[PDB]
C-alpha cells in the first residue's frame, strides 16, 4: 500500500452523544466544495471541507422529538431540478427527506415497523431508497411518487434485525445481513421487481411482498453480520471476529448471475484482519473507485487497506492514530476523490484525515 494520511483537524459536537453515521455527498459536481453529513442523537449536521484542514459548520438539524436517535443517513438528488437531498432515519422508524440547502424536512415515511438501521440509495435511480429495519425486513421506496415498491422479508426473510444492506455497482441486486447471522441476496433486475419499480412511477399503491431471497448463507460468520458491501461480484462482510471476509456465493467458478436460490456452497477468497474491533455495530466503507477500504476500531484507531493489492495482509496501510482519538469509530467516509477521510465517534468527536 502506497496511501498515507495526515490528521489535520478535529472537533466535537456540543450534544456529547454518540455519532453513528457520516457520509460525504458524492453527488456534488467537480470543483464544488466537499460536504459531509453526521448523524447521532436527534441531530443531522452538515460540514464543508476547506483548505488547511478547515471544517466549516453549515447547518444543524434538530429533530422536534428529543427521543429520536438517528443511526444512518444517505445522499441523493432530485432527478428533475438537480437539487441535493439527504435521507435520515433511526430508532423511531421514520424516514425523513431533508433539503440540505435549507436544513428543513421536505417529507417523511412511517411505513417500517421499529428501528431503521441503514438507508441506501440505488446507484442509477436517485428515487429508489432502501431502508433496513429491526422488524427483520428491507423496504424499497420510490421517493418521487411516495410509494413503497417492495417489502423483502417473510417466509424466507431475515429472522432478526437487518443491520446492513448494499446495492451492487449497477443496481441489479442487494445483499442484506443481520442479527440472524445470515447474508441474503435480493435481485431487483427480476421481471417482477423491474415491473413493480415501473408501476411505482405510474401511481392505494400495492407493494410487492418478496418472501424469498435469491441466495442465503449463514456459514461466513458465527455472530451478527453488522456490515456488508459488494466488491464487484464478490462480497465484503464483517461480524465482531476482527476480520472483514471477502467471499462469493457458490463454488470458486460460479457466476453470480447463474447461482440458483437453493445454492448451498460458499467460497471465501480472503480476510482483512485487524485488532480491537470485537464489539458489535462498527461499519466499514470504501472510496468511490473501491481502491481503499477503511474501518475504525473501539479504541480510536483507523485501519486502511489498498484493495488493488491482492494479498489482504500485504494490502495493509499504516494505521491512522491520534493520541486524543480514543473512542469507538462508528463510521468513516471518503470524499468522492478520496483526498479526505472523516471518522465519527461515540464521544461525538469528528476526525479529518487528508491524503498525503
Amino acid at each position: 500500500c502506497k496511501y498515507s494520511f495526515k490528521c489535520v483537524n478535529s472537533l466535537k459536537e456540543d450534544h456529547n452523544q454518540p455519532l453513528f453515521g457520516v457520509q460525504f455527498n458524492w453527488h456534488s459536481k467537480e470543483g464544488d466544495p466537499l460536504v459531509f453529513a453526521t448523524v447521532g442523537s436527534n441531530r443531522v449536521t452538515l460540514y464543508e471541507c476547506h483548505s488547511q484542514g478547515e471544517i466549516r459548520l453549515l447547518q444543524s438539524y434538530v429533530d422536534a422529538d428529543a427521543d429520536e436517535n438517528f443511526y444512518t443517513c444517505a445522499w441523493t438528488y432530485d432527478s428533475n431540478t438537480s437539487h441535493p437531498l439527504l435521507a435520515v432515519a433511526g430508532s423511531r422508524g421514520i424516514i425523513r427527506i431533508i433539503n440540505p440547502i435549507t436544513m428543513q424536512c421536505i417529507k417523511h415515511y412511517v411505513g417500517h415497523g421499529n428501528a431503521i438501521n441503514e438507508l441506501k440509495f440505488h446507484p442509477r435511480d436517485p428515487n429508489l431508497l432502501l431502508s433496513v429495519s429491526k422488524d427483520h425486513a428491507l423496504r424499497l421506496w420510490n421517493i418521487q411518487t411516495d410509494t413503497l415498491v417492495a417489502i423483502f422479508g417473510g417466509v424466507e426473510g431475515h429472522r432478526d434485525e437487518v443491520l446492513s444492506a448494499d446495492y451492487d455497482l449497477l443496481g441489479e441486486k442487494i445483499m442484506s445481513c443481520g442479527m440472524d447471522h445470515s447474508l441474503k441476496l435480493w435481485r431487483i433486475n427480476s421481471k417482477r421487481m423491474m415491473n413493480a419499480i415501473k408501476e411505482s412511477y405510474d401511481y392505494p399503491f400495492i407493494s410487492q411482498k418478496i418472501h424469498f431471497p435469491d441466495f442465503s448463507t449463514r456459514d461466513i460468520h458465527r455472530n451478527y453480520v453488522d456490515c456488508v458491501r459488494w466488491l464487484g461480484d464478490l462480497i465484503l462482510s464483517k461480524s465482531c471476529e476482527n476480520a472483514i471476509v471477502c467471499w462469493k456465493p457458490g463454488k470458486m467458478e460460479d457466476d453470480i448471475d447463474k447461482i440458483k436460490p437453493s445454492e448451498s456452497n460458499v467460497t471465501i477468497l480472503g480476510r482483512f484482519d485487524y485488532s480491537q474491533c470485537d464489539i458489535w455495530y462498527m461499519r466499514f466503507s470504501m472510496d468511490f473507485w473501491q481502491k481503499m477500504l477503511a474501518l475504525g476500531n473501539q479504541v480510536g484507531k483507523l485501519y486502511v487497506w489498498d484493495l488493488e493489492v491482492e494479498d489482504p495482509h500485504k494490502a495493509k496501510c499504516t494505521t491512522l492514530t491520534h493520541h486524543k482519538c480514543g473512542a469507538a469509530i462508528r463510521q468513516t467516509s471518503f470524499s468522492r476523490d478520496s483526498s479526505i477521510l472523516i471518522a465519527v465517534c461515540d464521544d461525538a468527536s469528528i476526525w479529518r484525515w487528508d491524503r498525503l
Partner: peptide, 29 residues
C-alpha cells in the same frame, strides 16, 4: 485470476457511474 477479472468489473462499472455523474450538474449545498 479471480482478482484481476473482479478488478476489471469494478473498473468498468465504476466508469459507467463516473460518466453518469459527469453529465450531471447537481446544484451546490
Amino acid at each position: 485470476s479471480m482478482f484481476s477479472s473482479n478488478r476489471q468489473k469494478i473498473l468498468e462499472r465504476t466508469e459507467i457511474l463516473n460518466q453518469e455523474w459527469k453529465q450531471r450538474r447537481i446544484q451546490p449545498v
